[PDB]
Symmetry: D2
Subunit: 250 residues, 4 copies
Amino acid sequence: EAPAAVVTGAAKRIGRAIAVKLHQTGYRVVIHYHNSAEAAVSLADELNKERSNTAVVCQADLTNSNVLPASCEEIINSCFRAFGRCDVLVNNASAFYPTPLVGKTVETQVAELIGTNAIAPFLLTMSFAQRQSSNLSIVNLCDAMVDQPCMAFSLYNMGKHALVGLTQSAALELAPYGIRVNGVAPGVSLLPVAMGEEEKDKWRRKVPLGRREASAEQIADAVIFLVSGSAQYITGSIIKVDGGLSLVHA
Amino acid sequence: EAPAAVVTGAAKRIGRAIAVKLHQTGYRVVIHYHNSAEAAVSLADELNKERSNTAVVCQADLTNSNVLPASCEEIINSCFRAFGRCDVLVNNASAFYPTPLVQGKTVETQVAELIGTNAIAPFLLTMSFAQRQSSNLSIVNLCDAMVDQPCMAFSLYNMGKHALVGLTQSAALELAPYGIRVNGVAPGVSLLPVAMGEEEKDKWRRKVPLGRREASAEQIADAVIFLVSGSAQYITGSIIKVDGGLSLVHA
Amino acid sequence: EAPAAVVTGAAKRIGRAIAVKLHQTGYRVVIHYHNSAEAAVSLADELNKERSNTAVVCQADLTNSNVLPASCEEIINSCFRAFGRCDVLVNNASAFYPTPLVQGKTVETQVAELIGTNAIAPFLLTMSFAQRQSSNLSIVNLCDAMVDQPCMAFSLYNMGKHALVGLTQSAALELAPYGIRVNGVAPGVSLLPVAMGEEEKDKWRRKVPLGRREASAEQIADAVIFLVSGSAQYITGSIIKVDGGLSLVHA
Amino acid sequence: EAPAAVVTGAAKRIGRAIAVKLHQTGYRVVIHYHNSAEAAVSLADELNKERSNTAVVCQADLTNSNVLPASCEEIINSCFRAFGRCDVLVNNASAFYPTPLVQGGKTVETQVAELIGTNAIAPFLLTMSFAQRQSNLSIVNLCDAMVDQPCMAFSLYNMGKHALVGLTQSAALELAPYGIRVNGVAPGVSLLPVAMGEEEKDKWRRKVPLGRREASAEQIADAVIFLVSGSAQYITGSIIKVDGGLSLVHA
Ligand SMILES: NC(=O)c1ccc[n+]([C@@H]2O[C@H](COP(=O)([O-])OP(=O)(O)OC[C@H]3O[C@@H](n4cnc5c(N)ncnc54)[C@H](OP(=O)(O)O)[C@@H]3O)[C@@H](O)[C@H]2O)c1
Ligand SMILES: NC(=O)c1ccc[n+]([C@@H]2O[C@H](COP(=O)([O-])OP(=O)(O)OC[C@H]3O[C@@H](n4cnc5c(N)ncnc54)[C@H](OP(=O)(O)O)[C@@H]3O)[C@@H](O)[C@H]2O)c1
Ligand SMILES: NC(=O)c1ccc[n+]([C@@H]2O[C@H](COP(=O)([O-])OP(=O)(O)OC[C@H]3O[C@@H](n4cnc5c(N)ncnc54)[C@H](OP(=O)(O)O)[C@@H]3O)[C@@H](O)[C@H]2O)c1
Ligand SMILES: NC(=O)c1ccc[n+]([C@@H]2O[C@H](COP(=O)([O-])OP(=O)(O)OC[C@H]3O[C@@H](n4cnc5c(N)ncnc54)[C@H](OP(=O)(O)O)[C@@H]3O)[C@@H](O)[C@H]2O)c1
Ligand SMILES: N#Cc1c[nH]c2nc(N)nc(N3CCSCC3)c12
Ligand SMILES: N#Cc1c[nH]c2nc(N)nc(N3CCSCC3)c12
Ligand SMILES: N#Cc1c[nH]c2nc(N)nc(N3CCSCC3)c12
Ligand SMILES: N#Cc1c[nH]c2nc(N)nc(N3CCSCC3)c12
């Protein structure tokens, strides 16, 4: 039977590309989304056209709250309900915006930034593991620039740092169950919609390898390697896919 | 007049030794505490016996919730209220317990406690500290030398301490233009947990290359003192391991 | 026309597994060796029996000396002589033995071998590789996942593997504009030393969270093949651990 | 009895400041120099003027060669000859210049010998000699906060500073049972190279978050003083950045 993967925030951009590549590799997919219903459904329909009954969607807010553990259990459960199994979890969904130290309240910002980037991945990991020639693994989308952060992104950066912790802690704890846990750490990949080209170019010009951002597919390629049979000894590793950006001094 | 410092979880163990050593150095101190009211009040008495009106206690839960920001604001406000200034913040308070991934508090409570005390409260305290501001302003965060070689089944804790590294770095960057330095001190094995059995304590002691023993609370405090001092005025974003070489030892 | 690769120390163990996998992927290969001539020739024979004129051997000492630069130039030149191009360089050859700080070979010989093979020869091979240059050019350095948790009394070996991390990063930066990617693969416990008895092997195996066993040579080679592939064309300056979680395990 | 310290490359700049502060703290000092004899003697004269027979000079090239081990043994021996003891070793001497990988005075192997010898091999040999000849004993290695974000075309220098991180960590582990602590101080931008253009100096200064200026030599020395002190007696294998946040600033 075909293996199955959950990809969070999979309606657009990197998560979409990850879902597509997994599908092309032979996985059935749960496309998790928050607000982007039309795009999630569009993707599911495209994937099911290619092969019937191989893609479903699952809506959830991954903001931290009292109901987050249940929402996370329900995402994993939907993979088991659709496909009978859950082999791969990709923690991709992420809130990203500034929170300077000096209309959303700060606790709402905490909930969203820390919930999406850290707590939801932890809860999803718990639910994934509890539900367990297998090749089980988790891939967390990290940040190559986590030790050279953008100015005034404290909470975002804290979330991504916590995600490195999770990757390492879960790699250690789940290794006896045969579940590998790794990361992929983009530098500059797809830039924000509507960011002016002139500002995109300030970031692009910093990248040693080609003075361009990573495509979503280039990020997805590293995810594919990590879930593959060619990575069966690899756990707790975080692979930068950054064109050398992180090596560049100020 | 004398500078002033806030130390969180300062009623006992490492936080107490930090508060003591700051006070010996010249600081007026806010002794924050959660449950350890008797020990906090007793420390404030000891320090005030040495120099009157140089210590106050301040009670707060640093578990994450919708009122955590107000609580953190109030800790900083309590230093200004007692002393008219706030020069140093030491983020020492910390929950520490296992949260296994695979099968009596709820998981949401565990998240709130472990992530709140180790990460969110230091963030909010840092915000309130900066907002309220010769001078030598700085923050010291109590980190963990074993953050990349964590205890088995401590994912939430480890996540909190990793986030604390991120905060230390991010706040060092953002607050540098205001002359506020932000650094860390990362113990390996120091005062063993009260609940840990004697055999397990001896197991941990035996892992430490430099002396086969735990760091004293005073040894940790010595590093905090250095970082807040005039001898550390160009140091920001640095995390100093005080671990006797423990983090260097392979499995 | 098929691309071509140089693998240093390729007569056996991990270097052989890398050359075999590259050859299976469609590369022509230069099998560098130092003392292991029989094994090297035996490998070239096997690969050439599979596809004619696709493997050659190349002998060189990679100990540091005043002629090491000429030796490294000649290794690269051997790939151009055989195959008319050189797309991939794998720096695998390595001396590995203790050098106690307190107490056969003179210390300067130990420096020349340990630092030469692990760091200086990779540097010179990298210079020659770059100087001699649809296309997918890259270099892969065999690093060590335990570089920050080293074996006791292996100072010079550890210094050499640390230098190799530096080269990997420096070379990635400097050669990015030429389209040459520079990455590493960092084993933890893979094939154990021939001189190690089974009991000592089992002590190391038991340390590994993922399966309590060493990485196969093929498992190491798999990570090399990825980094040289089209699937890694935005990856440069990255060191991939292939260690089964070993580096995450505390003392 | 006053403790004694060896400081390599102590005639000028950061090494001079380290020698001065150690001396001011109560140490007797060996001022090592290569080319700067006039300056080394001028320093010694100044220090002996404060306290008679507390400063001596010691000449040596620290370029790697057949004779480097003997030269390093004699640097340590000079401290025991002058003062009867050797408590502290500061590995400060360093060659620093570019070594491009791609080319359009020195042979590349001479560059290897200077850059890797001064920054890594001489520190290793001085460490062996220091430990062999053996209280608050420690070693401090001058590292580089930008070791993972290196200057373009400085591969060999960077390899040497990476190897020094390895030595710091390896020696911390191996010498801990002897009570010898081994730590590092990692500047970012401190005293700018004398041959750097003034416009290039201001470009580096403007990058620094904490004050948009370089560290003074004394602010670097302050961190050395902490690490050798009784306030750091549980600290080994630690590298303290003194970089004003520079290493945290993205491209
Ligand atoms: N792009 C880059 O350059 C870059 C750089 C470094 C790291 N990364 C990381 O790589 C991953 C993918 O990057 P990306 O740029 O493609 O991400 P993105 O577009 O910023 O976010 C991906 C998705 O996250 C979901 N999300 C946001 N808030 C959510 C919430 N409260 N609950 C549930 N889902 C939520 C959204 O789903 P809906 O649209 O359905 O609402 C969104 O489409 C992220 O983890 C990101 O942090 C990206
Ligand atoms: N001891 C070690 O070996 C070691 C190792 C690595 C890192 N560290 C770090 O160094 C610091 C000091 O360690 P330690 O062992 O002295 O700490 P500890 O005794 O575990 O905790 C210090 C204090 O934190 C406070 N605290 C706990 N939960 C709290 C909450 N919800 N709200 C407010 N305060 C709370 C407690 O105050 P009350 O008693 O008043 O309730 C406690 O006394 C901690 O950050 C720790 O993680 C220690
Ligand atoms: N095995 C592991 O568990 C492990 C762990 C961490 C890192 N690594 C790294 O991964 C790589 C492969 O490991 P391995 O165990 O397969 O290596 P290895 O067997 O120890 O050495 C591979 C080859 O290095 C060559 N070599 C040694 N000294 C040389 C010299 N002076 N000049 C030229 N070549 C020389 C030898 O060639 P001849 O036989 O032709 O003389 C040898 O066959 C190495 O870089 C190693 O440091 C391995
Ligand atoms: N300045 C900075 O911004 C900075 C930044 C990062 C790291 N660092 C590190 O901090 C330390 C001090 O920096 P600095 O700028 O003061 O150093 P420096 O002036 O570049 O060098 C200090 C001394 O090294 C000695 N030296 C050079 N080559 C030598 C050789 N072949 N044999 C013996 N001695 C030799 C010289 O002694 P003579 O003059 O007697 O010949 C020189 O005066 C160095 O380790 C450096 O790498 C400095
Ligand atoms: N868009 C988007 C991001 C989603 N997660 C990100 N994380 C970082 N560290 N940077 C980001 N960007 C702003 C700097 S340039 C690369 C894009 C993003
Ligand atoms: N008490 C306490 C701790 C507070 N934060 C800690 N962090 C770690 N990684 N270990 C700890 N300990 C368990 C190992 S032995 C020393 C104590 C503690
Ligand atoms: N053989 C071999 C090694 C080549 N480079 C190595 N580097 C380390 N840190 N360990 C190694 N080993 C000793 C620990 S068990 C696996 C082998 C080797
Ligand atoms: N002098 C001197 C240096 C000795 N080691 C150095 N390492 C780095 N990474 N930068 C340096 N400088 C050039 C950049 S500006 C600060 C000085 C030096």
